[PDB]
């Protein structure tokens, strides 16, 4: 439609002359055409959201508005492409503004002026299942399916040969009538029909040892890590995405750092992908937000990934999705709610705050779709708060909807060890009901092994602390034996790099026979104690220093280094 | 020392900050309440101009 | 009724004047892009009627816009043949199970109940957990609040007792041909992981055996968690008293209950807030746990057993005060025994419960129940009590007379209070309860009769 | 009559418009339905209702009928075992009309002119009547029921019917003053029956507790608070004070109760004993308690009904006992309200207007001669409620505004399952220095010296208890730890008062004298024992303590053979020992 201002207070526009608007409505205020929103209708006047701030603007002007509620794009494209929270590409801003952006920019959403490959996997007179198959484009990355939105079941005719074709390009169209092109307009408040929401059973792989065997989510899951970024947490963030099966990676912030966000971003072609080859940046989808990014931006960026990720999780693909800030996502919220009636009223943040923050998590997760195929959407909560308080909205709110906190602590990364999850002050609600399958699908006594295990490291915690103040020397020998049993846990199990390549990608069928051994050696020197045996002795075994070189091999001469390394423990406690 | 911190100090000296807090933030209920109030009666006022 | 928007807030908004609306009327207003939607009618006028609103207000134009009236006050259909099914999202069973057939309509907004129609209880509720039946006596009289934790979960201890309640051959003298073992279960918020969790443990309890199974689904919009917990109440009230079945309402986080409801208030200017949870919050409770009890005449009766979390240990904020207030004692599970291994954890000393001999007594229950009740009691208490003052001077604080109520501290420990999920028997439970009692001098007991010394020693 | 329609609703209030010629405060009746309301706020002609029971299926338009008269509670014949609940209403009846469930828009008469009682004259025609004085006598019951002339009403007399039976509203004595003064009277529920000169109480109260009594009394006319957090013995001791009394009338108004509450309670009350017929507590108990299911001001309207009952009673001459529970019902009441009636809210959504009432209420009891010339008590146990866990909350220092006596009840005594539990350090009382005359003339002179006697013990337990979490006291000397265990059975066998043992759950002068002088003598033998070299480790094993321990194992009503026995092998043998 078309209307005319008549106030400007703040960033937000009010303009009469609209009638017919629609709700969540695409508004380009002024003559300037700011990236704005329709919201909240009263009288023959709308209240306007606008995302950039107005300081050029003028009342009275025209606002044009398409008329047709705000969508989320879908398209080719996007792998291996920058975007932001208004899904702008941040670098075609960067060549055709400058360096510096001046506002009332709007340029595609996706790169449209490219001319994307095609190949048609239907034909006319076949039926078209929705949110599968329409045509599959070649990418190097690996591929891309561009498939039909849901509920668009009908007969297809004119299905043209594989070539290149622009996204506006046209490749297929119904025969029933209603046009398609390869860019799809998706609900931004709305998710995507599914046939079972299933159960998560296989097992979310993040290559690194403790981070995943010890405490998994499994695929599906809902996590956290808690604490700021720069005591070189970030360290997890990266290698975590970079290692962990998936074939798309998504990476998403808002209201993140300065300059630490953007060697984030040009370190993260620098990133290199284990299933490929080559780089993550290949197959990496960029929506984030720095923080001199307009009001609403940072506040609509969640919503954004979220459908995106059921996108490529319809084409059979696995994604890993990494919500970057939650804490400061909030920080938009209060503003704008301030500035209308929707004022604070529960504890110095809006009520409206926890209905928001659910949804994120609600409409992800491992869940089959109408198209038939599989893919997760496994959702890693850094929250960090600037110290958080359990009587703060914030804590108290997420604390609930996520079943995990994979807990760091300061302490823990001083000693410059990834993973340094402080096991203590770590929990996932998910292992109960993951045993079942994990015996299923990976090995025999692999669940059997970590419940069993994990309990070294809790007989130690109380243990050290003051009643151990000089080590053990005028203590007895049961109590010994744990600290023997607990070096080498702590010192080559917890240990692990992400800048040696023998191990900073490890697999399951190198960490079970680590752990295996573990066991076996406090199942040998606790019973070493029982026949007469020393301390010394085990501080002399060459076994110790076998747990060390079993991560410093990686997993092709595993099957090698676990015949002689697991036959050498036997035979070095029926030495003593 | 230790037996007695991780009862009745610790917490306690947390629970004092908490107590304070809420009863300094749910105060501003009021605040917020009266203000609205009050913006109501500021239009009500430029809307006697204009009409009734 | 005339529809006339010229207004748009949150969750309510402007429906010119008013002339077949009620208070609590099923509306249902077409956004005019072919999705549509129902609402509840609140602060109804001759001037501005605000609509409550169910689902998003996206496509929602000024153009081709109706509101129509579908029932005068809330109602919705209860047939005889609900129990064996599972009812999956509002109203209709949404995970393949065809449509629901009602045979009567009536409210489900809740309907009176006289107070001299109530009757105290006389039947034992045995449920498969011998720590908390024993001191805090379950009983179809009470709803007790399960207190969880954080690291101590609420869903563990939610799934647990589901199917583990059974009602007695003629120890309460009362058949258990004459009601069922059948149950119903509420959500008043279920997220993903949660509903995941209750999976596998529905289909242990029989979900489509016996049990009526409502849930939100944990995807469906917010205004449903605040509409589930009065529905799965009045819709149990006529299967209940009329048909003479007694059920047990297994309800859970009545956060996500507060939580969802504040937003509400917060844009029609009730001003939410007490310490930032409704302060309306008791008002619209009242109603939800009203029948909890159990009614005279009719047989079969209705139960509320509560299960919400603590953000803090502490009881200063809403979540757990007034809920407190409100039900009828409290049993709290602590963390204390949850930090050693212990499952379940009970701790009783924080514990404390409305009726302790009331629906039990000899031969309502067993003839030692009643006296083994206040005895397991103040028998840890004076355990617990040395471990204290142990720190405080040297490294020890008792002598041998004390030495005894020690080891009492550590047998009602792991051999009592864990014992994983089995089921226990009001028989097991107390028996053995008498095993650990034999650590103690019996010449030193005095919250407990001296002819019942005689019977089990 | 008022006759307007409806204009907006607004939750359970409704607010309504053609309203012209309505007073604040009356009769109205919403809708056609008739749910009972009260005209409240009135800006312009438009006057705000708020209604007692629900607004469900209650559309706008529909006529709103009002008396022009005020709300006023009926009051005559067939009070006791009756109900008037809190909004004005006999459940007893509902019960059988509206079957199971209560259906609203559904009213009767709050008084039940079903019934019929004889009359036996007091008075005659060519007499001069007074305002509260009585007219004749009624046998209800095991009580005595008078005919209160209305207040402010004078003139001479025309007839008085001969005695017999006759129905409740019609007229007995008809006034030659052209007024035939019906059998029952209204009198508005704000205004309070007169009195010809205020006095101040001083006969006891007992109640049925031992420590509660004995350490902080209250008098017969006198208040207290019992402020009790998270959920603890306050909702159940009250059922445990209400349980036995000294007064003569027992009016309970739990104001709004909670239904899981009302159940035991109701029901309880056809097997306690009643010491004037033998039967029922119900033929001296009246309830006002109303549900909890209904709305807010349901639960406001029911502390005002009570109170007019109350003076009723105290007017005939009789000691009435008053009993609020909860005052987590009457903040909750104007919390809402509040917001309903554009109110604007003082502080933490408690209303400007808060002690307006609340104060009042407080101040109408005390022990008080009449304008009918008789002399009764209002004497009131209102039990507190902090909603949110401290007394730091405006509801709650309000009801510390008055004056009086006072309880304490705390959290951590009440899980050891010894109620009442009762803090020395937090409770004070002006009716021990009141009592005090009454005491050395009925009780015994040595019970204004006695009690001082118990005081001190636990006096100096405040003092040591503190010193004891620092540092043992094995560690302290020898009369350090006398007094320690002397206050031991002050807990483990006296403020333990078992609601389920009846040899505790009874409890009088006797059984409070007694019990203190056994205390007494051990007290003041140990303190020489110990001068001796004798350590209090000894003396635990040594038989004298389980002695004292004898209070809930001896009976009410075959005490007297006990305590004497008992009490000389105190002073015998231990200084043997």
Request: net charge negative.
């Amino acid at each position: 439609i078309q209307g005319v201002i008549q106030k400007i207070a703040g960033p937000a526009v009010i303009a009469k002359g609209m009638l017919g608007a629609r709700m969540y409505d695409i508004c380009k205020v002024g003559e300037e055409g700011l990236v704005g929103e329709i919201i909240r209708l009263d009288g023959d006047t709308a209240f306007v959201q606008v995302y950039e701030d107005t300081s050029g603007l003028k009342v009275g002007e025209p606002v044009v508005s398409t008329g047709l509620p705000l969508a989320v794009e879908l398209g080719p494209g996007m792998l291996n492409g920058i975007y932001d929270g208004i899904q702008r590409p941040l670098e075609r801003i960067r060549e055709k503004t400058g360096i510096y952006i001046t506002r009332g920019v709007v340029v595609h959403a996706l790169d449209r002026e490219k001319k994307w490959a095609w190949t048609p996997m239907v034909k006319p007179g076949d039926e078209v299942r929705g949110g599968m198959v329409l045509g599959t484009v070649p990418e190097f990355g690996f591929t891309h399916k561009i498939l039909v939105p849901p509920d668009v079941r009908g007969r297809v005719k004119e299905v043209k040969p594989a070539g290149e074709y622009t996204v506006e390009e046209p490749v297929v169209v119904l025969e029933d009538g209603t046009e398609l092109k390869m860019y799809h307009t998706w609900p931004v408040r709305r998710a995507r029909p599914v046939q079972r929401k299933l159960d998560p059973n296989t097992p979310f792989l993040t290559g690194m040892r403790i981070l995943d065997v010890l405490f998994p989510v499994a695929m599906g899951g809902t996590a956290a890590i808690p604490g700021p970024f720069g005591s070189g947490k970030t360290v997890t963030q990266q290698s975590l995405a970079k290692w962990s099966n998936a074939d798309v990676v998504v990476y998403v912030g808002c209201g993140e750092r300065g300059n630490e966000m953007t060697d984030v971003l040009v370190e993260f072609p620098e990133l290199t992908d284990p299933k490929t080859g080559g780089p993550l940046m290949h197959r990496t989808v960029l929506i984030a937000n720095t923080s001199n990014m307009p009001v609403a931006a940072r506040e609509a960026s969640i919503y954004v990934g979220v459908t995106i990720a059921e996108y490529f999780r319809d084409q059979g693909f696995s994604v890993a999705l990494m919500a970057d800030s939650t804490s400061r996502w909030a920080e938009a919220l209060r503003e704008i709610s301030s500035r209308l009636e929707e004022m604070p009223a529960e504890e110095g943040y809006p009520p409206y705050l926890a209905a928001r923050l659910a949804a994120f998590y609600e409409r992800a997760g491992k869940v089959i779709t109408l198209g038939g195929e599989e893919g997760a959407v496994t959702i890693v909560g850094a929250v960090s708060p600037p110290g958080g308080d359990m009587s703060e909205p914030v804590t108290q709110s997420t604390l609930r909807i996520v079943g995990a906190f994979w807990r760091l602590d300061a302490s823990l990364a001083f000693r410059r060890h990834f993973p340094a999850i402080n096991w203590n002050g770590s929990y996932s609600l998910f292992t109960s009901a993951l045993d079942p399958w994990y015996r299923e699908n990976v090995a025999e006594d692999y669940p059997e092994l970590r419940d069993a295990i994990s309990e070294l490291l809790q007989r130690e915690a109380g243990l050290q602390e003051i009643v151990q103040l000089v080590g053990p020397d005028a203590l007895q020998d049961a109590e010994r034996l744990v600290i023997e049993v607990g070096r080498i846990i702590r010192e080559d199990f917890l240990q692990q790099n992400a800048y040696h390549e023998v191990d900073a990608y490890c697999s399951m069928k190198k960490a079970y026979g680590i752990m295996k051994m573990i066991l076996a050696f406090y199942k040998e020197a606790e019973a070493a104690i029982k026949r007469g045996v020393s301390i010394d002795e085990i501080l002399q075994l060459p076994v110790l220093e076998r747990i060390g070189r079993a991560r410093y091999v990686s997993e092709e001469e595993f099957p090698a280094y676990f015949e002689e390394a697991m036959k050498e423990i036997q035979g070095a406690f029926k030495a003593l | 020392r230790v037996n007695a911190l991780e009862q009745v100090v610790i917490p306690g000296i947390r629970a004092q900050i908490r107590f304070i807090q809420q009863v300094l933030e749910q105060r501003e209920r009021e605040d917020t309440f009266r203000l609205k109030r009050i913006k109501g009666k500021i239009e009500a006022r430029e809307a006697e101009e204009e009409g009734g | 009724e005339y529809t006339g928007i010229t207004y748009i807030s949150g969750p309510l908004l402007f429906v010119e004047n008013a002339k077949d609306l009620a208070y609590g009327a099923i509306v249902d207003i077409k956004d005019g892009t072919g999705r549509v939607r129902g609402g509840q009618v609140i602060e109804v006028s001759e001037e501005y009627a605000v609509i409550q609103v169910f689902e998003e207000t996206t496509g929602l134009d000024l153009a081709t816009t109706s509101v129509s009236l579908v029932e005068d006050v809330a109602r919705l259909g209860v047939s005889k043949e609900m129990l064996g099914r599972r009812f999956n999202g509002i109203g209709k069973p949404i995970d393949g199970l065809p449509p629901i057939t009602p045979e009567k309509r009536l409210p489900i907004t809740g309907l009176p109940l006289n107070p001299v129609a109530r009757r105290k209880p006389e039947q034992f509720i045995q449920t498969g957990i011998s720590t908390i039946d024993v001191m805090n006596t379950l009983v179809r009289g009470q709803k007790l609040p399960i207190f969880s934790g954080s690291g101590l979960p609420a869903n563990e201890i939610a799934a647990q007792i589901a199917r583990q309640a059974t009602v007695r051959p003629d120890l309460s003298g009362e058949g258990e041909k004459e009601e069922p073992f059948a149950v119903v279960f509420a959500a008043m918020g279920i997220t993903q992981r949660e509903l995941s969790y209750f999976i596998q443990e529905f289909e242990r309890t029989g979900a489509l055996s016996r049990s009526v199974l409502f849930l939100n689904k944990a995807d469906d919009p917010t205004i449903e968690r605040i509409l589930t917990p009065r529905m799965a109440l009045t819709v149990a009230e006529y299967l209940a008293f009329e048909h003479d079945y007694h059920v047990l309402v297994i309800l859970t986080d009545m956060t996500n209950y507060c939580e969802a409801l504040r937003e509400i208030g917060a844009a029609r200017e009730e001003i939410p807030g007490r310490r930032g949870y409704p302060g309306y919050m008791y008002t619209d409770l009242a109603t939800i746990y009203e029948r909890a009890g159990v009614v005279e005449g009719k047989k079969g009766s209705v139960t509320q057993i509560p299960i919400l979390s603590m953000p803090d240990d502490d009881r200063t904020h809403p979540i757990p005060d007034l809920t407190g207030y409100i039900t009828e004692g409290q049993i709290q599970l602590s963390r204390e025994l949850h930090r050693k291994g212990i499952y379940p954890p009970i701790d009783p000393l924080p514990s404390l419960s409305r009726l302790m001999n009331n629906g039990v007594g000899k031969g309502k229950t067993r003839e030692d129940h009643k006296q083994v009740s206040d005895q397991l009691y103040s028998a840890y208490a004076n355990g617990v009590d040395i471990r204290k003052l142990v720190a405080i001077i040297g490294e020890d604080a008792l002598t041998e007379n004390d030495r005894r109520y020690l080891q009492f501290a550590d047998a009602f420990e792991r051999f009592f209070i864990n014992q994983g999920q089995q089921n226990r028997s009001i028989e097991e439970s107390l028996q053995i309860a008498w095993a650990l009692l034999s650590m103690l001098p019996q010449g030193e007991l005095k919250r407990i009769s001296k002819d019942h010394i005689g019977k089990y020693y």
